[PDB]
Every structure is written in structure tokens, then in C-alpha cells.
Amino acid sequence: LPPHYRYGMSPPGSVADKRKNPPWIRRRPVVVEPISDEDWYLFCGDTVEILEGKDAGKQGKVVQVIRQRNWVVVGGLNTHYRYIGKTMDYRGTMIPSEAPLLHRQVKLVDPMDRKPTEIEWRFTEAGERVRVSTRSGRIIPKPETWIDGPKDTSVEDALERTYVPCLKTLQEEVMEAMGIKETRKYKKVYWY
Amino acid sequence: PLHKYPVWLWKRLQLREGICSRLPGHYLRSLEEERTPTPVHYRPHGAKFKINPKNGQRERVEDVPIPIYFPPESQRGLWGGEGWILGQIYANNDKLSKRLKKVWKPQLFEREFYSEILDKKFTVTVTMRTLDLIDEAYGLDFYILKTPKEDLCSKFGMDLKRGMLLRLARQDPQLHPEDPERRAAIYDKYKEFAIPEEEAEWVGLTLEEAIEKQRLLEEKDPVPLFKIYVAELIQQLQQQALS
Amino acid sequence: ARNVVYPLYRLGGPQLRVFRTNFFIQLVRPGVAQPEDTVQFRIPMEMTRVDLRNYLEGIYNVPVAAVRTRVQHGSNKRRDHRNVRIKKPDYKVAYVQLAHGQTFTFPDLFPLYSMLEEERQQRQSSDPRRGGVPSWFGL
Amino acid sequence: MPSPERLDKVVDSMDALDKVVQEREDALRLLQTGQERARPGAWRRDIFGRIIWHKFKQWVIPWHLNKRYNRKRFFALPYVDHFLRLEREKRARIKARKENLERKKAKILLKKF
Amino acid sequence: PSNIKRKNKHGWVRRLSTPAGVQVILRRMLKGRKSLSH
RNA sequence: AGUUACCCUAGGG
RNA sequence: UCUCUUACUUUUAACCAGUGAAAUUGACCUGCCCGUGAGGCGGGCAUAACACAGCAAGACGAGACCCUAUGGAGCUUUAAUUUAUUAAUGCAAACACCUGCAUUAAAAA
RNA sequence: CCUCCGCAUAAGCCUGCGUCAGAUCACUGACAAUUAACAGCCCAAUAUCUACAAUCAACCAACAAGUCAUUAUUACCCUCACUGUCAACCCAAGGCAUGCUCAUAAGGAAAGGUUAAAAAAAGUAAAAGGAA
RNA sequence: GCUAAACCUAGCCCCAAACCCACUCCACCUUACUACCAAUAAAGUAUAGGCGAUAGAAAUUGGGCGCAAUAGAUAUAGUACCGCAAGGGAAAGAUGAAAAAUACCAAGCAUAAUAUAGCAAGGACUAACCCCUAUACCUUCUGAUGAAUUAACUAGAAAUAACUUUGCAAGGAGAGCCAAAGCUAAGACCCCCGAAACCAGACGA
């Protein structure tokens, strides 16, 4: 993907993205404040409080994070209205649409105080690093079966250790085990 | 922008960088020397100062060596400190005449000498001046081990020098077999220029030749990790045993 | 194997063996009418005819009677926004005639909306006799 | 395509298998021979004066009677060093531009925030 | 037009055959040309 | 020192 | 060919439809006679506005020739002086080749 | 109704009127294809042999004097790999090597519609005279 | 109201600092990208020179009053394109927090063709025209040249002396230099485009 490529709500490869960002656009880049990977503290599934714009003071859940633009999409909040399925003769159906919010316009919420608080990333003996609130010494945990198929290896077969560490190459082990015999000896050649 | 270092310092920087840095110190010193070859094609001034007849005051005078072009044939032979003078002249020694190109070539003589220390008849292209420094130095041997690199200005001269100095350093019995008294006589005759063998090994080497020697010297087959690990395991067992 | 140096052979030397083959293959539907015993493959450029025969015989236990190969030239007649030519890669086509009177035919592979559709039956299209007056009002 | 993810998964699995076998091969080679690479090679200096890693090929005859090999020049004549210097200066220019542009971008970032 | 003629006069081998051709290639490499030869 | 119908360039009539 | 041109056909052309350049262009509300020095000045005269097709009298549009430059280039020589050289000689050096110093020519500046 | 063109190979070019879909006197995206017997791609050494043209090659007929070949000893046992193969095409804005057909079995279309002015171009016919 | 206009930021420039680059596998000197065979000062002083145009020592001393898409790199790229080759060498983009929300201004025209007469105006006028007055401009001659039009770009660079204004004053000046009111500091003077040639090294014929 080209440099200064503009990240948006549609995923970087989608049809809407190829339409919005064809291979020949050169727009003004967006100034995103550099937040280190270990300084980020809003995750998908997090409950958050909205400070700015419409829906200020309402609490929601982080549905998507676009970390390339310090963006959090709070599901059902910061919402305008758009029509979908606009055909030639049908106006389509109106639906609520979310606009991204910068991380500065969103705070995290304690599970018992239910108030917006600042967060630091403190080390814990049990867990090497975890979030903590500032107003209180409370940790905020990170939020969010199967059937084996005809071509899925069982865990019992997958984890079995059949490897005996030896000083033979795969070629040699396979030749010995497959009973391939070779009496002809390699005649050394010149390398240069 | 600007370079950190002047461009003429880049050769000197390179000499301290890699395999050049790993060369013997004495050889790098020999490369570093810049001392001036003795005047051959120009007359040096008597003194540093001189009173000119024009204004009658004393000024300092310097001798600016005339550039000498040494054709590659000179490196095979043994000329003096002399070679070609690629210059210009005025048509009839008058500055109001045209300027026209001249080359001054030496007179080459295909003479034949005998190196006693190397005990060999060498046929060499020389100059009359070479014969003169031969006479003043009392022999090809003394001439070769006396005359410095810039005054010799010959690769063949330095090959002879390196051979001679190695033969001295090695105390080599192969000069005159079944003839020890003459060998000792010749070897004592040149006790003055006795040098360590390591120093004699790198004498007269062009820089590329020295790099080639060094890269041979430090070329070793990589020792297999098997014996390193075996020795480490043995050492650990020794440490555990003493516990 | 592709993208490897092959050990050089000299007279009376061991057989060259490949233990984990590196080139992969697809059998594609012919674009034209072909005999019944002919199977068409797309094949890497380095893979030879003997290699393909041995590959099928060994890995897939397919008895192969004949193999033919051609190199298909990909088009260079298409350009970027920068008027720079875009290359469709060249590839190798193999035609494998099966042995023992066998036959191959290419198999017939490939033989949120609720609310949108439920409102799609609730058009209640504009009545011509109303003449543009909104139908929402109960008056 | 019905499910294109499993193609990527198969490719990743085969890359993993290649990595595992290659690790074993190089561990054994380091143990027995001490060499770090399977193919012999050297640090040479081609006609254009640049240092390259020449990888060796397999031949039947030794190199001194190899007519084609001896046509190649693994040395640079003194007319190359000027071009080497000019390339060095071109690289220096590109680096200076890059580092300066990074610094300007940092200034802009600090201005906005 | 002839491919033999073209590769004979302006090709890589003909260029590297002489110091002048090596300098042509070096000039083109400094300029950043995509095609250094025929 | 001649010469240019091979002359050439900047201008002028 | 001409006295001496005529008829026909095709192309072109004119009109209808589609597509659609270029040189050119100070601005123009762009007349005639005479005079001065001519669509534009002076004196007379004329004079509603508006296409399309024509014509080619005027408006508007190369190829030469001479001179100049304290501007070039080439060619020929018995311009300047010189022989860097190349061919010869003569003399030095060395025990003929190679070198240094002078002279004579061709080809040269 | 034209055909002085055509069909192959070479050279050159490089997917450049195949299918599906779309936009634009009235190209883009996707998919598909040229399958070797033709043609490229050759040759184990060491010596040692290679005077008498072609032209129906027989006379004739000559000068410019010619386009062609093996032997001895030694070594030798594995075999059908690789590559070109498409088109309405190239070079310039008319030219093009070779073979085959010498009007075609192959290949094409001079008229966008009308009118029937001038001038212009080409063609045909022209009394009497026939270079004025 | 069409055509259009407008936009800031990609990047770049000059410094400082610091001495840079170069083997995933594979292929590449054969027709390349082809597995494999015979500081400052001394000082513009001494000096050199058709002693002239000019040339000229030494001893000695010690981040931004930057550009911001015709700019700034040629650079969106040494790409497209041109050339057999060496080689030459471009143009251009702009919404917003979200696209998982689609007005007003060049020339040229249109709305809206024209009416005796004439550098197209000026004086006027109740009144557009009618009346009166009015030889386009620039350059070069003493008094033919160029230009369709719009937008952008586009052309005076040197402080010796002197002068003015300060400082200090027989001294001035932060070494060196000058001084018979001088010395120190400042200010203020010297454009753009446009040959044939010659030389060096390549590339083709």
C-alpha cells in the first residue's frame, strides 16, 4: 500500500477502500500523535466514556480499533444516519452510522466506580503488566467450542514427540528408513 | 553536504580499517614514510638561505624536485634514481619562442652483475649512474641493502633486498653448501644490515601483495563447533568434579 | 525442486534424488476440445516433462503415457496510471495423456439481509392518484 | 473461491516445515564443519568496484583452465574510484535528506500536539 | 532492425569489453537508468 | 600571404 | 499544342448529416476621389443592417547580392619563425641497437 | 464490381478484431490459448588425406578459372531433454528477403446522402486545318 | 452559468553533527541477469611578467528575516517519451472527524447578433448614436521592428577613497593597520536573453 495512504473506516483492501483510495491518489497525510504500542490502553470490548461531541457522557463498548489513526469506534455512539441499499428506484433503509473518535475523546471506566479515570500500565507479580486506574488501585482486565474435521490433526497426534535428536540429515534418515541403497560415491567437483 | 574527512585522508583512513589494520606495524610504517629521494635530474641549492644579486637581501630558497616518470620497464631493471623527464622547452632557449614538448630519456645498458649473497648472475638493464652508485657502494650487495626504497625506485631492487635480508635473517646454509667458511665470511661481511626475519618478510612488498600475504596468513578452516562443545562439556565436568 | 542448485553429476555418480519437491502444480480445465485421455496442467517454468511424468507417477500414482509442454506468454499490453507496462506472468502448460486406456473429464466444481429484504416487500409504492402528497399523514 | 484462508494456512505450514528442517541442517553443518552457509562463496570486487558476495558454482575442470570463468574480472581498474566516490556522495545526499525530513516531521508533530 | 546487430554493438558484453564501455555502464548506474544496456 | 561556386555566425544596406 | 474551344464521365465542388486542424491575428466601429505624407491625416463625395458563392486589383504575406566584425573555419604556398617530431646525415657516449648535441628535407604548426 | 495480389517461411514485432462484460462517422477488465515429427539447439582425440568446375554434363563452348570428399589407431553404450510455434503483425508516413499461384480454389470494396454552379484535376470524343 | 477558479503538504534547500553502503533462496562478464569442460595578519608586500593584460609568496603570527507544486531536487521518476547508441528527459495532487456520511473572482463564451461615420474615446447631452475634438503604442533612425489574449514566471551583484551620521580623540581600532584631526562603525555604486568556433573523452557511421 502506498505511503501517506489514508486509513479510514473501511478495511485497507475492501471494495469501498479501493474506490476511496485508488492507486493514484496523493492526499494530505493525517497527523497522528505517536502512541507507542505499550502506551495504548483502549481495546476491543472495552467500556468507554465519551467526552466530546454528541453523545457526551454516554458509555459504550469499543467495537473496532484503528490504531493507525488513534481511532476507537464506540458501538451505537457518536452516530449520524445514512441510507443503505440505495437502488435506482428504492431510497434504501436508514440506519445509524458510527464515526470514529480519537483516543483523547474517550476515557476508560472502572468496573465498580463506573466513572472515567486515567490509566497507567503497572507491573504485577502475577501478570507482568496490566492496567490500573488512577483514582483507585483497581485493575482493569482485558476483555475478549470446536469440532475436529476430516483434515484436522488431533491434539494427541499433533503434540506427540516423535523426534529423536540425532546427528543425521533428513536425507539420511529417509534413505535409511525407506531402504534406498546407494553404492555409488560422489565424485568431488570444483567450486569457484 | 560535506564529508567528515578530507578526501586525501581517505587512503590513510583505509589503512586503519580492515585487513590493512591487521598488517605488521613496521610495514604500515614503511608505507607511511614520505622522505624525499635524492636529487638526480636537478642540482640542489647549497643552503637554505641565499642573497640574490637583484635586491641584495637574503631570502630562503627551496629545491623543488623535477617530476620523474618511471616507465614500467624500470621496475624490471635497476636504473638509478633516474627516469624520463616529460617537460617542455622553448624553441631556441629564448622565451619569445614557441613552447614545445620534450622527453628526456636515460641511456639504458644491458649489463650483467653477480649477487654474492644470493650467488646469482643477474642480467639487468641499468644506467651509467647505477654503475656509479655501484662503484661508490662497493658491490651490488651493499648497493642494494644500503640504498633506500625511494632512491632505488625499482620493484626488482626491493625483491633483491627482500631476498638478501631473508638470507641474512635465516642464516641460510643454502648460500654455499659444503662450504661453511665462505658462507660465514659473506654473512659477517654484511652483519650491519642483519634484520629480524619477520621484518625482512614484508620488505619491498607492494600494498596489495602485503594484503594477499596477510589474507593467506589468517585464512583458517572454521573449527567445528563439535570440539568446542566437547571441550566445554569436559571443562564443566572438571568443574563439577572439584565441587 | 525449484530455486536450488543441483549437485553436479559425474560418470558413475549417485542418482540425483529430491526429498521434498518444491514445485507445485494445478490441473486446469482445457480451454478447447481435447481427447478423452488428456489432462491439462499448469506447471512451473523449471519443471520439465520427465519431472512431471515422475511427479504424477510417484506422488499421485497416475500412470502417464505421454507428456507435452508449452510456454504461454503473458500479456505485456496493459499499463499503470504511470504508463508503465504491467506483465501477466508467463507459465507452462502440460498435456498428460493417461495410460492403460483411462479417461479423465474435468469435474463440475461449483454446481443483516433479513431487515433489508423484509423492508423490500414494504415499498408501498407511490400511489398515482395521490399526486405527490406524503402518505404518512392520517388526515 | 470457497475458502481462500486454508491456502494461506497450507503455505504457512510448508514454510514452517522448511524452516524446521533447515534449522536442523544448519545446526548439523555448524557442528560437523563449522561453516555457516551451505554454498561456498567469497567476498569479491567486480569490475564496477563494488564488494559482492560471489556464490560459487560446481565445475568439472579447475578454474585456471576454465576459459569462460577467466573472462570475468573480479577487480576494478583505477577509473572506477571516481564513480565509487560519486555513488558514495549520492548515498550521502539521500541519507541527509531522509534524516532532515524526519526531524522536520518531528517538529510538526510537536507543534500540533 | 536486427537483434544480433543490436546485442553485438550495444550489449552488456560489448560494453564491459572495454574501459570506455565500463564507464558508460558506470555513468548509467550513477544516473539510475533502469536499462544499463541492450 | 593568396583564396573559399563548401564557406560559417552576428549585424547593416 | 495552337486557330479556338466544346461536350460528356469521375474526382473535386455546393447543400444535408457525423467528426474535426493549421499557418495567421496590436486593437478595429476595417469606404471612394484628390492632396499631403494612406481604410484611418486635410478637402470633397458616398453611406440602413445582415449572409452565402465567387474573383484576385490593393492590404497582408522566399530566393538572392554586397559590406562590416581588431567574429570564425577550411584549402594552397616561396606570410612570420620553428623542426616538437618522421627520414636521413655529422659529432659526442658504448664496446651495431640505445642515448645526447647540431644540420638537411618531406609532412607539420 | 476489383484483384500488380495472395498463401507460407525468414526477418522484425510481442498477445495487438478469440470468449465474456463495459465505456468510447457510428480502448478497458476478466478468462482462454501456440502441444514436435518442422526449425533451432551438434559433433572424442592424435596424426594423416582433399590436381581435374557448374551449365540436363554428353559432345561443343570457353574464361573471369570455380561452391563441395577421407584414412589409421585409440575411446565409446546412456538416449528423444530444452527452446520457437498466437494475430488483422514489421520499417517509415510508400519500402520490404525467399518459395509457391501466375488469375486465382486465395484476397478484397472505388460511391456517408444529394445536387449537377464556377474554378481546379484526370479521362474520353471532337468539324476544317495539322506546329501556325 | 459554463469553462473554470481557489487550497497545503508531499517533499526539497542551505548548515550543523557524524566518516556510509552493500549475501532470504535463486540468476547474472556467453546475446548480462544463462546449472555444468583445455582562520587572522605579514600582504596585494617581496617578487614574476609582450616588466603588460595580469600573476603573486614565504620567514613570521596565531537550526533557518529557506522554497511551498511554473517554487524548492529533474524527480510522482532518471519513469513515460525521444534516440541505433552515448545521450537527452517531462507533466501532474488538493472534501471532510467520518465517504461503513456524496455561491462571489482572468481570458473565452452564454444569458443577450447588428443599424450612416471612421485608433473607437473625450467634451458633452434630456438622450446609446447622431455634433465638435482627436495621425494606436514600443524600438530605431536627425524626426520599418514587435505584439491574439489571459494567468504565472522574468532581468544592477563590488564600500578603496570621498560624503552623511555616530563613538572616541593626538589618538583610533577587541594584536596585525592607520594617524601633521585622525581613526573606528554604519549607510549608500556597478543587469537579462541570444554565435560560429576550439579542446578533452565517449557513441555511432
CSV table of N, CA, C and O in Angstrom, one decimal, chain D residues 47-50 73 77 79-80 83 86-87 90, chain E residues 12 16-17 19 22-23 25-27 29-30 32:
chain,number,residue,atom,x,y,z
D,47,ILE,N,34.1,-5.6,-11.6
D,47,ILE,CA,34.6,-4.5,-12.5
D,47,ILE,C,34.1,-3.2,-12.1
D,47,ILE,O,34.9,-2.2,-12.3
D,48,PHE,N,32.9,-3.0,-11.5
D,48,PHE,CA,32.4,-1.7,-11.2
D,48,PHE,C,32.9,-1.3,-9.8
D,48,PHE,O,32.5,-0.3,-9.3
D,49,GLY,N,33.8,-2.1,-9.2
D,49,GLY,CA,34.4,-1.7,-7.9
D,49,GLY,C,33.6,-1.9,-6.7
D,49,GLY,O,34.1,-1.5,-5.6
D,50,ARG,N,32.5,-2.6,-6.8
D,50,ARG,CA,31.7,-2.8,-5.6
D,50,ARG,C,32.0,-4.2,-5.0
D,50,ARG,O,32.2,-5.2,-5.7
D,73,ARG,N,36.1,-10.4,-14.6
D,73,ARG,CA,37.0,-9.6,-13.9
D,73,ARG,C,36.6,-9.4,-12.5
D,73,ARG,O,35.6,-8.7,-12.3
D,77,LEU,N,39.7,-1.4,-12.1
D,77,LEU,CA,40.8,-0.6,-12.5
D,77,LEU,C,40.6,0.8,-12.0
D,77,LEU,O,39.5,1.2,-11.6
D,79,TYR,N,40.0,3.6,-12.9
D,79,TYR,CA,39.0,4.6,-13.5
D,79,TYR,C,37.6,4.4,-12.8
D,79,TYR,O,36.7,5.2,-13.1
D,80,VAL,N,37.5,3.5,-11.9
D,80,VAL,CA,36.2,3.2,-11.2
D,80,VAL,C,36.1,4.1,-9.9
D,80,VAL,O,35.0,4.5,-9.5
D,83,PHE,N,33.8,7.1,-9.9
D,83,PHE,CA,32.4,6.7,-9.9
D,83,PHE,C,32.0,6.1,-8.5
D,83,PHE,O,30.9,6.4,-8.1
D,86,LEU,N,31.4,9.2,-6.4
D,86,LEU,CA,30.2,9.9,-6.8
D,86,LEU,C,29.0,9.1,-6.3
D,86,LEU,O,28.0,9.7,-5.8
D,87,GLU,N,29.0,7.8,-6.3
D,87,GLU,CA,27.9,7.0,-5.7
D,87,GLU,C,27.9,7.2,-4.2
D,87,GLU,O,26.8,7.2,-3.6
D,90,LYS,N,26.1,10.4,-3.6
D,90,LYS,CA,24.7,10.2,-3.9
D,90,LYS,C,24.0,9.6,-2.7
D,90,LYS,O,22.9,10.0,-2.2
E,12,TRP,N,25.7,-5.8,-23.1
E,12,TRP,CA,26.4,-5.8,-21.8
E,12,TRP,C,27.8,-6.3,-22.1
E,12,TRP,O,28.8,-5.8,-21.5
E,16,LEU,N,31.2,-4.1,-21.4
E,16,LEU,CA,32.2,-4.5,-20.5
E,16,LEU,C,33.5,-4.9,-21.2
E,16,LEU,O,34.6,-5.0,-20.5
E,17,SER,N,33.5,-5.0,-22.5
E,17,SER,CA,34.7,-5.4,-23.2
E,17,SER,C,35.8,-4.4,-23.1
E,17,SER,O,37.0,-4.8,-23.2
E,19,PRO,N,37.3,-0.4,-21.3
E,19,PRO,CA,37.1,0.5,-20.2
E,19,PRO,C,36.1,1.6,-20.5
E,19,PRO,O,35.4,2.1,-19.6
E,22,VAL,N,32.7,0.2,-19.8
E,22,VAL,CA,32.5,0.1,-18.4
E,22,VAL,C,32.1,1.4,-17.8
E,22,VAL,O,31.3,1.6,-16.9
E,23,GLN,N,32.8,2.5,-18.3
E,23,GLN,CA,32.4,3.8,-17.9
E,23,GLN,C,31.0,4.2,-18.3
E,23,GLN,O,30.3,5.0,-17.6
E,25,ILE,N,28.5,2.1,-18.5
E,25,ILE,CA,27.7,1.4,-17.6
E,25,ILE,C,27.7,2.1,-16.2
E,25,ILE,O,26.7,2.2,-15.5
E,26,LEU,N,28.9,2.6,-15.8
E,26,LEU,CA,29.0,3.2,-14.5
E,26,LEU,C,28.2,4.6,-14.5
E,26,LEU,O,27.6,4.9,-13.5
E,27,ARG,N,28.3,5.3,-15.6
E,27,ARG,CA,27.5,6.5,-15.7
E,27,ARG,C,26.1,6.3,-15.6
E,27,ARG,O,25.3,7.0,-15.0
E,29,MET,N,24.6,3.7,-14.2
E,29,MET,CA,24.3,3.2,-12.9
E,29,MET,C,24.2,4.4,-11.9
E,29,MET,O,23.5,4.4,-11.0
E,30,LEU,N,25.1,5.4,-12.1
E,30,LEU,CA,25.0,6.6,-11.3
E,30,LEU,C,23.7,7.4,-11.6
E,30,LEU,O,23.1,7.9,-10.6
E,32,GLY,N,21.0,6.1,-12.5
E,32,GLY,CA,19.8,5.4,-12.0
E,32,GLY,C,19.0,4.8,-13.2
E,32,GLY,O,17.8,4.5,-13.0
